[PDB]
Design a protein around this ligand. Sequence first.
Ligand SMILES: NC(=O)C1=CN([C@@H]2O[C@H](COP(=O)(O)OP(=O)(O)OC[C@H]3O[C@@H](n4cnc5c(N)ncnc54)[C@H](OP(=O)(O)O)[C@@H]3O)[C@@H](O)[C@H]2O)C=CC1
Ligand SMILES: NC(=O)C1=CN([C@@H]2O[C@H](COP(=O)(O)OP(=O)(O)OC[C@H]3O[C@@H](n4cnc5c(N)ncnc54)[C@H](OP(=O)(O)O)[C@@H]3O)[C@@H](O)[C@H]2O)C=CC1
Ligand SMILES: NC(=O)C1=CN([C@@H]2O[C@H](COP(=O)(O)OP(=O)(O)OC[C@H]3O[C@@H](n4cnc5c(N)ncnc54)[C@H](OP(=O)(O)O)[C@@H]3O)[C@@H](O)[C@H]2O)C=CC1
Ligand SMILES: NC(=O)C1=CN([C@@H]2O[C@H](COP(=O)(O)OP(=O)(O)OC[C@H]3O[C@@H](n4cnc5c(N)ncnc54)[C@H](OP(=O)(O)O)[C@@H]3O)[C@@H](O)[C@H]2O)C=CC1
Lengths: 238, 218, 239, 218
Amino acid sequence: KKLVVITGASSGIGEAIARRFSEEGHPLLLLARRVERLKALNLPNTLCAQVDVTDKYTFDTAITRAEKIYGPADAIVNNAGMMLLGQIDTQEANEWQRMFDVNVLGLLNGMQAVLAPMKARNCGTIINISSIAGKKTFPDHAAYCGTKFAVHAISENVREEVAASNVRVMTIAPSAVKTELLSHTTSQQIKDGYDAWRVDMGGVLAADDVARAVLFAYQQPQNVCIREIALAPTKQQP
Amino acid sequence: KKLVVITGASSGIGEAIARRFSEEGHPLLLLARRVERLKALNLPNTLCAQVDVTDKYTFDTAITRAEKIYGPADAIVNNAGMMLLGQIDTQEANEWQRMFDVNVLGLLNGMQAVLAPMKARNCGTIINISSIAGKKTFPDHAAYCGTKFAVHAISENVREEVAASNVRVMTIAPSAVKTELLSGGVLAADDVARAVLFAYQQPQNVCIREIALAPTKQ
Amino acid sequence: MKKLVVITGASSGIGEAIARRFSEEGHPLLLLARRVERLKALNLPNTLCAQVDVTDKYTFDTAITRAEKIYGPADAIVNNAGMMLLGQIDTQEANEWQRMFDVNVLGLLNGMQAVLAPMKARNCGTIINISSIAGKKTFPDHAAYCGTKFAVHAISENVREEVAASNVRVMTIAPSAVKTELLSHTTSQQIKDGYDAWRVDMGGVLAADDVARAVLFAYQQPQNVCIREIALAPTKQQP
Amino acid sequence: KKLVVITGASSGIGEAIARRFSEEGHPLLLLARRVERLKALNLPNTLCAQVDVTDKYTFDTAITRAEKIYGPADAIVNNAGMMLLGQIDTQEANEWQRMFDVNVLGLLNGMQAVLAPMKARNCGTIINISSIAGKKTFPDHAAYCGTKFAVHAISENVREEVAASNVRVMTIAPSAVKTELLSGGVLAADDVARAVLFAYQQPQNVCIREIALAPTKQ
Ligand SMILES: NC(=O)C1=CN([C@@H]2O[C@H](COP(=O)(O)OP(=O)(O)OC[C@H]3O[C@@H](n4cnc5c(N)ncnc54)[C@H](OP(=O)(O)O)[C@@H]3O)[C@@H](O)[C@H]2O)C=CC1
Ligand SMILES: NC(=O)C1=CN([C@@H]2O[C@H](COP(=O)(O)OP(=O)(O)OC[C@H]3O[C@@H](n4cnc5c(N)ncnc54)[C@H](OP(=O)(O)O)[C@@H]3O)[C@@H](O)[C@H]2O)C=CC1
Ligand SMILES: NC(=O)C1=CN([C@@H]2O[C@H](COP(=O)(O)OP(=O)(O)OC[C@H]3O[C@@H](n4cnc5c(N)ncnc54)[C@H](OP(=O)(O)O)[C@@H]3O)[C@@H](O)[C@H]2O)C=CC1
Ligand SMILES: NC(=O)C1=CN([C@@H]2O[C@H](COP(=O)(O)OP(=O)(O)OC[C@H]3O[C@@H](n4cnc5c(N)ncnc54)[C@H](OP(=O)(O)O)[C@@H]3O)[C@@H](O)[C@H]2O)C=CC1
């Protein structure tokens, strides 16, 4: 079965997606900075590389040396990302830079790594992990919403342009998923408010709920393109 | 397994959805005006009624009658819809009236038929067939795009309002599906149906709010 | 003598305010509403008043023909007539959805069709549709009204693209929270009370004239400049 | 009248906005890299500073210096931006980096420069120049559309968060304006400038949240 590359596989949604794709029999390339946590997953058929997705050169290289083993990447899941919440009046400006670097430029690196080849052979699937925050706004999310709307726009724009080469581009837009994400935010008060929101919801999506949707989209015949799947706990409100 | 109601099941997308839900073992209420094509699907455990979704009384009664046989509907697929194309400057105005009546009002009727009881048991799934024309405009499609943008907004609004009752509201947005609507960048009706089923089959606490799908090409 | 402007829903609220501004600019007007006496009590110069229900297309069309005999071709129509019937979909009277879609959508489509072929032929004219930020965003108790207003947004954009080459303009004006008669038509006294407390709580709300100034500004741009959308709301508006 | 800060004022839209605000009697701070084009505008009561908007320190300092002279900024126009077109499969990645840095981070820098003081005053207006490319995708524009969609979201989000402080946040979305971007059917820069001025000049309690404009034709 065809190689699948997944960024940010070391926890959360990416870990869950790796498990499902492995279990379907795909050989994998998993990319994250915490490369030993990747190894501790113990998946069959399964190259782990220590890669920062904002390092285009290391990124592309890892990919090339994985395709020397498993053939052309038929899919990349651009999943690596971070959420640094804050108010624009006070938030540390370097938090904006880091988020846009991973959530947007990292993802663009991911797309460019595979897009030329996929177009040439008329096959392949780009799956970008956006968010319902790419669709609407949320308190303290200004810069993060910025990255996710950009991801939404980038995805739709590329999808239109590679349609004729029979390449698929997919946007997966989760909300409220139990992962490490919220823990990177700077303000303890924001994290507390967020955690109570999810508690009050009756809890929240499991990473695997996103993973099953990602795999379902991918497993459709090449000629069927699920452009978008948006998902959230049923009880999610404001 | 629980009753599922499907409007517009006499061809195309709604037929293909009926087939997938039936194969999965759900008893069905199939609603449409050509009841004889419904009968001809010859699906097991499937009630066929002649109902125009704009006729609220006949619609409600069909559902009540069906829930007596197989118990309360756990999903309704609002799929009945029609596409009348034209330029606003010349299009016959009754076409607008009829399209909004079927595509929007009919859909509202279906939602109101199940919403109160679903909220009361804290379970239920409403699945609305919108369109990629409910997210973007197209030449000749003005009034039709209108109905589908209406469906998107109504679905979003209602979803927010029933979330606290554990009731799911899902929008399915296909494009370029081979069906009777007009009457390899085309979709099979069954491409839509697998997505509708996949969404319904998630645990009750997981709501796939939207799936938009189209042929890779075109 | 400037060009004729047609305005629907001119008997109160936003439509009345829009009529005053256009009258002040020296446009002769045709004003259309069901309360034709309130129209007449506006006392505007160069102003034809006609008792028209915009869901009655034949009367609608006719009223327009009769005004163009006097003042020449309508250079603008403001499709402003509308109503907002708020409610929960599980309990709202279904006939409220029908009435609201008939005025807010079909009414407005009637208005567009009255002028569009002629405007396209002479390569001039402006269609101004009053949508709402509820045409962009959802709001508690607004399900059906949001439906009408998203439909208005979609219809406007679609028609705008199609008549672009004929140099006709189609504009969407999307207000929120304007002091008018609108909210008073809603059925539930509970909803009305909650809504009114919301507008009080934000510090009050737009004046009708705030919308009218934006409409006039968009229209007064040269014919080759198309302001496609203006969205506006009290500054202090939030959830 | 009150100080207005305008970024990207050395050509195109930003120049046209500067002229309209100056003619209306506002003292200005003009920021851009070609300081000598700024000086060459020769506008009354107008400070010209050489600032790259991505250079946060120089940006903030320029504003502080200007507010000593003419008082606190009542508006900032975040207009500095650049458009590097390409297909994602071949585009030089540094073009993405720099577009986002200028079009998004530059704009965030400008917002953070005035936000807290405006909140404290309960007055002020932030005006962000987006695009119809921030509402709509276009061939060859993927990364650029990305930046403008980001600008739309950021603007909407910040508007909701500062509304309670009586601070206005407005997005102007033009299309096809005759400028240097690209280095009928076409808008003059002054078409944008009149809309920007009209929005600012409404009473403080009236927030024109968005204006999208384009040539009627093409
Ligand atoms: N959780 C939620 O509620 C939602 C999440 N999302 C999106 O899901 C995606 C995954 O996040 P989630 O699993 O939730 O959060 P986690 O923090 O659990 O996972 C983030 C993943 O990205 C990796 N990563 C971060 N920075 C880099 C980098 N520079 N280079 C390579 N890898 C990096 C991390 O690995 P390592 O640090 O080892 O490099 C980790 O594997 C993100 O894009 C997030 O925005 C969208 C909507 C909702
Ligand atoms: N085909 C495509 O490419 C796309 C389709 N869609 C949507 O898919 C949905 C199904 O249409 P599609 O399968 O394409 O076209 P079809 O015409 O094949 O299906 C139409 C179904 O709707 C039923 N129907 C029509 N009017 C009524 C009514 N008044 N009361 C009850 N049932 C009615 C018809 O049955 P009967 O006449 O017997 O009553 C028929 O069963 C529609 O809502 C359509 O807008 C969305 C995007 C794309
Ligand atoms: N007020 C607000 O907060 C907002 C309003 N809007 C839109 O503004 C527009 C005007 O409403 P607004 O001024 O607020 O409310 P009002 O109720 O004050 O005005 C409604 C106008 O429409 C007329 N009208 C209603 N039905 C018909 C009909 N069937 N035929 C002809 N005319 C009709 C009414 O006149 P008569 O009964 O005499 O016929 C009245 O002049 C509406 O489309 C509304 O949706 C958008 C966003 C916000
Ligand atoms: N032109 C069009 O059709 C449309 C334009 N827009 C937006 O309008 C805004 C203005 O661009 P437009 O007038 O068209 O094009 P111009 O190139 O004429 O204007 C660009 C302005 O931005 C300044 N600028 C660029 N980079 C920086 C920087 N790093 N720091 C400070 N200033 C900078 C440039 O000055 P200098 O080099 O001296 O630093 C110049 O003054 C842009 O954000 C653009 O995206 C949106 C839709 C359509």
